[PDB]
Design a protein around this ligand. Structure first.
Ligand SMILES: *[B]([O])([O])C1=[C][C]=[C]C([N])=[C]1
Length: 357
């Protein structure tokens, strides 16, 4: 890396690790459309295995970007519409609530109070349906934003319906492969197990446990290299050869709703650039990010705005990730750690480094 970049990263990251007590970390800066990688520490402390560019990490919520992108591609293919009511795809979903809730609502957390999480007692397809049928909304559709896995997960389960594929095959075929994310998995195969880092929560080594709609809402595992490649793709959609994906990417970055100074895409979250750092930093905090907030509709939605600060945080019980990019400046960063540390800290660091370029 050019010394500038080096200095920046090191200057900012080291202290973060030290303070947060992060066992491993990989970072990639995308500068002028070129990535530069940094790794630190361990992937597995016990076996003293270090973090490399091949180490796999749990994306947690950053999976939502993928979901949102696979959904846009489906839209671009003419297989679904955001305006379609949910029932068109899950006709058994017969209860009165479901009435006017469309794919758009689900995909954006504005359905009217769907829970953050799917209850752990929900296992079968039967449990699921019940869960849905019996859910009672707190608000009218399209009035209040509630960050929810059961909201977005559901959208992604249904988006792939017309295709005929399972969520995983569709992601693979339609997203991973075309983009050349060969080390990106929902289910990590045996041949890759050796590179899969241990999450660490309370000194204990942990892995994401399976659950309803996990693939769809938080099930991706990937590497710093593939992450960087994913960031490059979202930064320059137009260079993507596959029409639908290209288009699909752009739709995921479209602005459907606004709250405070933030806009809701399809998995992505964006702000206007330049941005008020206090805004994003503090906004990232759980108390704020997970709360119920009133939304204003953008009618019609605004197409992907080059001047933005695009991003998404993500976490599992043993990991914590962050991605941010500014299409207009051809810059981004990706931060992967095998420890779930505080959001604002991630935000602060990303902004420091990115502000410096
Ligand atoms: B996801 O893993 O529920 C997620 C959302 C917002 C912040 C973070 N760290 C994770």
């Amino acid at each position: 890396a050019p010394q500038q970049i080096n200095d920046i990263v090191h200057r900012t990251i080291t202290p973060l690790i030290e303070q947060q007590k992060i066992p491993g970390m990989a970072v990639a800066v995308i500068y002028q459309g070129k990535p530069y990688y940094f790794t630190w520490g361990y992937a597995d402390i016990a076996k003293k295995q270090p973090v490399t560019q091949q180490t796999l990490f749990e994306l947690g919520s950053v999976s939502k970007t993928f979901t949102g992108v696979l959904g846009g591609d489906a839209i671009a293919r003419g297989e679904i519409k955001l305006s379609d009511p949910t029932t068109k795809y899950w006709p058994e979903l017969t209860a009165k609530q479901w009435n006017g809730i469309t794919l758009l609502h689900l995909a954006t957390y504005t359905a009217g109070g769907l829970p953050l999480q799917v209850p752990d007692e929900v296992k079968s397809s039967s449990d699921l349906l019940r869960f849905y049928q019996n859910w009672q909304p707190a608000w009218a559709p399209g009035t209040q934003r509630l960050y929810a896995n059961s909201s977005i997960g559901l959208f992604g389960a249904l988006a792939v319906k017309p295709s005929g594929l399972s969520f995983e095959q569709a992601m693979q075929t339609r997203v991973f492969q075309p983009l050349k994310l060969n080390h990106t998995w929902i289910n990590v195969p045996p041949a890759e197990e050796k590179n899969y880092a241990w999450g660490y929560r309370e000194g204990k080594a942990v892995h994401v446990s399976p659950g309803a709609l996990d693939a769809e809402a938080y099930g991706v595992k990937s590497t710093i290299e593939d992450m960087a490649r994913w960031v490059q793709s979202n930064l320059k959609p137009l260079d993507i050869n596959e029409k639908t994906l290209q288009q699909g990417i752009q739709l995921a970055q479209s602005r459907y709703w606004q709250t405070g100074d933030m806009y809701q895409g399809l998995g992505w979250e964006m702000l206007d650039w330049p941005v008020n750092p206090d805004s994003i930093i503090n906004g990232s905090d759980n108390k704020i990010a997970l709360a119920a907030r009133p939304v204003k509709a953008i009618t019609p939605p605004t197409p992907a705005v080059r001047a933005s600060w695009v991003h998404k945080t993500g976490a599992t019980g043993g990991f914590g990730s962050y991605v941010a990019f500014i299409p207009e400046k051809e810059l981004g960063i990706v931060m992967l750690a095998n420890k779930n540390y505080p959001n604002p800290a991630r935000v602060d660091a990303a902004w420091q480094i990115l502000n410096a370029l």
